Design a binder for this molecule. Structure first.
Ligand code: NAD
Ligand code: NAD
Ligand code: NAD
Ligand code: NAD
Ligand code: MG
Ligand code: MG
Lengths: 260, 260, 260, 260
């Protein structure tokens, strides 16, 4: 379990990040939620997790496109929660276009959130974790941090960068009670993916579910979506003492995507 | 938990395999132990696990250098235990030499046990797992399934081969309720490693613990050995429902060995 | 240019090996051919090659499924041709079946040729190359030495093993004027592949070309076959002085196969 | 040979880029040089290459930290040279510090040049290359695009990003006459590396060559630096027709660095 520990999960107001925050709360960790969406729904999520699991849950609406706001999220988590044991760098965005059609604003935004926010959050966390002699940094990269798809240049570059950055984090902290690893999921049916399902159904003139199956079949041999609950379990495992010597690596949760 | 499941762990009379078997037993799985050793000592291990964890524990001493014995171990497991849910292919040997000095006899032995036993065990298990709609194949590869060292050609080749074979097992079973993955440890201070520590101590004319630290420092950034307990916890995670979409991949438990 | 250097190409009587042997001949290297087939055609090829490029081209029908025959091929290349500069380990075979249906004989034969022949070939070549202070070992692995496909367990395992073995070869020879690398081709339209195209045509009820394009389309983004000519040019590059510090690595010639 | 072709080589006033430009000029390619340093020396280099190899050589001093300047470099190369056949994305910078000490300005500067300039350059080049039905994009990544070192977070992230980006480039252009690949060098003794040798020398209290040897032995099994001339040869090879199906891959020129 994780009783007495504090976890900050970026982009945990929905999707994968909410599944990870929920799993960590279920292990007894105090939680800092973060991310956008509807404020009433966010408060319900926050109060609900605290009540259900009997842990402290805070919400910090920092916009993680700004480096100082990311560092502020971590530093304020320590101020309010008293420590930071687990940092899950999860917030991310997507945009698809051919490289020559890829707007520079979109390239910049994807690098800022999907890559640079991992840097800033890690930089802010590490002095605390070093003083603690304990930390777990868990970066949510992607199958796209190990391999590529067409039309996803900024996202694939960013996710590859996160994988490299995770390795450096591990090497700088090796032996200090701190590990850093990157979870690399295949498809998870969140709004990030639903948008691309919708696009494919339009392009192909089929219904939504036919597009969903095709999207899966192209990439994911199992023909099964990964779930936020599975990814929460994986984060819980990396946070555990069994994973004390798992550091600087990727854990692919992808139904066979990268095996072929 | 793994109540009502049966796990076979090859080479589980000592070292890593025993740590894995013990961890799975503690989650409530029935266990088939395998490997060599003293009758009284093995029986104490077997009877002690059964009594401690309240599970059935069989010992089958089959020599896994012969394909027919490996398949017979899986057969005997199903015969005596009723089913097979988890196969951990762990038994392995080492031999160090320059490639041009490498005894063909040792090349052959290392491939037969370190690689071919995985094929034979997997082949025997899969029809059961496929009929059940459930299975977990957990191969114990190495950091040497992903990178190399000098003087370990048969071992690196076999372990690389295990990684490839794992991927194919996964693709053949995708979506069928079965996963196959390879745990890739760094240094674990078993007799397999102690022999190399001893060899270094004599070569460099220092004491055992200086040789121990140098063996670690050369490969493993954390400067800490991985433990059988940690690898057992890693196996338990791979066996769990959270890992239902982790397939065809490697899990490096190596203290940063492969990150640099 | 490779004037006054000697290259052994295993399995060079046909397909990829022939392409490599040719390209190296055209660079002024002495050749030892090897492989199976009508001895009249083999003299025609061997003579044609010797005449056209002004090089000594020998032939040796050694069956490389046997360790001592492989070690013989090399030593007899040295006795006859004076030296060995380039060893290309290329001979290999394929067999498709589910793991549980894979005959042990086929498993064993695929390992013996596709993997163990590389060990035996290398073990023999090394003493000469080392005393010479120059050598190039070029292993013909595959995309399947890096990723996997369903139904190719022995092939994928041996080919991963070659990649691993190549790395160890590099490390043991580092700085000694010798490099070892593995070329990893995607689909090359040889009989080894024609066989599989034919099977797919029958399975789907389509002509040979619809089957070929679909085979390509599945794996190879460029939708173009790799050629023995190209693989030959790749071998030539690896043999050049520019590649002096290219060691222990793979060169993927695969039209994008491993990129996604 | 590359007669009639135009190559743009970023940061080719010094080091690896100059080696690559030189190699390409020698094959008959017209060259656009770029980068900083002494203007009189740059002119000697530019006029020298032009006269030595009988090709047109232009200097464009665009500061590639600005995306518009990178696109301007490519667009003006097409304007002044008639076409663009080969784009070598080479310019890069280094800064070493622990993650928590790493200045944001240096993080941003490294991503902008070492990663974003690769996007901007590629984006400008692609419409031209697609029109022409021929293109070669050669990205100078690093061993640090595939593995990590402590204290190099921005550089390792950027270089991993370049490896990912190269893959997406390959997939988007697959079959169209264009390839995109990433050359991944180990140590090359440029001023980028000399600065590190100097810091090591002062850290350890040794002379420069003791520090050079130690920097070498830490990472590079061959104990030999890679040369700009070798990298030029590799670039030339990738520009060749033999590499027409080499796309979306890395070519490691690293003396065994990533093998272990
Ligand atoms: N869905 C998938 O198939 C998939 C697969 C692999 C990896 N990933 C990665 O998982 C992570 C989460 O993705 P998801 O699919 O759950 O997406 P999602 O859109 O459902 O969730 C994104 C979360 O990030 C938050 N967010 C977005 N911009 C933010 C900002 N500027 N500051 C703070 N928060 C911000 C959102 O409010 C939300 O909480 C991403 O990094 C994504 O790249 C997703
Ligand atoms: N110790 C390490 O640092 C390390 C690191 C990475 C991977 N590994 C791998 O982990 C596995 C276990 O290694 P370990 O260090 O615990 O070794 P170990 O020598 O301590 O134990 C090996 C086990 O396998 C059994 N065994 C040996 N030959 C057998 C045979 N022919 N048939 C049946 N059983 C046999 C032994 O009886 C013993 O139970 C091996 O596959 C090894 O390659 C070990
Ligand atoms: N064809 C492809 O798409 C492809 C792709 C990637 C890698 N490869 C690899 O390239 C290599 C050659 O393949 P290919 O397509 O040219 O096959 P091929 O069937 O066209 O040629 C096989 C060659 O090896 C020889 N050979 C077979 N068994 C031998 C033995 N026991 N001893 C000596 N020689 C023997 C044959 O005589 C022939 O010359 C193999 O290692 C294969 O795994 C092929
Ligand atoms: N030296 C090595 O060991 C090594 C190893 C692997 C990869 N690399 C990579 O090789 C590339 C070149 O490295 P090098 O060692 O030759 O370095 P170098 O410093 O000797 O050369 C760098 C070149 O880039 C130019 N440059 C710097 N900033 C620029 C800017 N804003 N706009 C345009 N040009 C600019 C410089 O003027 C110079 O021409 C880099 O991408 C580097 O990361 C270097
Ligand atoms: Mg793939
Ligand atoms: Mg390494």
């Amino acid at each position: 379990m994780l009783k007495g520990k504090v976890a900050v999960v970026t982009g945990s107001t929905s999707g994968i990040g909410l599944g990870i925050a929920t799993a960590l709360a279920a292990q007894g960790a105090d939680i800092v939620l973060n991310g956008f969406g509807d404020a009433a729904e966010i408060e319900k999520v926050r109060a609900g997790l605290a009540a259900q699991h009997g842990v402290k849950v805070l919400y910090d609406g920092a916009d993680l496109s700004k480096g100082e706001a990311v560092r502020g999220l971590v530093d304020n988590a320590v101020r309010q929660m008293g420590r930071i044991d687990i940092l899950v760098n999860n917030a991310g965005i997507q945009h698809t276009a051919l490289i020559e059609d890829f707007p520079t604003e979109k390239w910049d935004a994807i690098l800022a959130l999907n890559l640079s926010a991992v840097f800033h959050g890690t930089a802010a966390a590490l002095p605390h974790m070093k003083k603690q002699g304990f930390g777990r940094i868990i970066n949510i990269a992607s199958a796209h941090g190990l391999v590529a798809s067409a039309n996803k240049s900024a996202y694939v570059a960013a996710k590859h960068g996160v994988v490299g950055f995770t390795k450096v984090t591990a090497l700088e902290t090796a032996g200090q009670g701190i590990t850093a690893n990157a979870i690399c999921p295949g498809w998870v049916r969140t709004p990030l993916v639903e948008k691309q399902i919708s696009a494919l159904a339009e392009k192909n003139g089929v219904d939504q579910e036919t597009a969903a199956r095709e999207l899966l079949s192209e990439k994911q041999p199992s023909l099964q979506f990964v779930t936020p609950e599975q990814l929460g379990g994986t984060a819980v495992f990396l946070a555990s003492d069994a994973a004390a010597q798992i550091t600087g690596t990727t854990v692919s949760v992808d139904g066979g995507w990268t095996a072929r």
